Amino acid sequence: IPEYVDWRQKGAVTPVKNQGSCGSCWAFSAVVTIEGIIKIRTGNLNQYSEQELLDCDRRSYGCNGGYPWSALQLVAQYGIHYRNTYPYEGVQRYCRSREKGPYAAKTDGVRQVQPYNQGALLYSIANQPVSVVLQAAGKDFQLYRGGIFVGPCGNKVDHAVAAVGYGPNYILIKNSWGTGWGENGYIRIKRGTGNSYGVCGLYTSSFYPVKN
């Protein structure tokens, strides 16, 4: 695989979003992976609905938290709508997938990257964007303005984000806290520390949507 990977350079990632004051991270995270694989497969880049996931995922807790893998399961079964058809409100209402009409896209499945393994993660990122979790509760993470982030931080993961690339010494992450945070909404986290958990727990649980 390559030394450098950046899905933005292949026209596979959409503008940085802001989840606001709602624990929708898991939905935003899954959506980045969906927008990415569809572009890679079909050639078109569209924004998909995080609100739909927020409302229609029964295994997740709406704005109280949720699971990227379950949100990714939902799309592989029932598909998903465009963000424009089913916009983001920052509050969980009721599932309106049927009302909005036919789904815009549907995935074929979801797979898990072998955990606590930097190589297994890089390999997957070289194929498509990946849903990844980390600990964002630390002040250092919250105050990040740029650079290859090395911490300090623990591995009490509590925020789902998406990995859209990597380099010799970092993993490029797309966050959902707006463009005013980090490097225009992005963060480059240190890799190859030999830490199996990954910086901030980055290697705890990673999933990606499958689509043939």
Ligand SMILES: CC(C)C[C@@H](CO)NC(=O)[C@H](CC(C)C)NC(=O)[C@H](CC(C)C)NC(=O)OCc1ccccc1
């Ligand atoms: C509720 C969890 C299980 C799910 C995750 C992912 O959404 N939640 C979160 O990550 C939550 C979101 C929500 C509660 C406002 N994050 C937060 O509440 C954090 C702040 C807290 C920890 C002091 N949000 C936060 O810090 O806002 C972003 C920001 C900070 C500094 C500069 C620019 C932008």
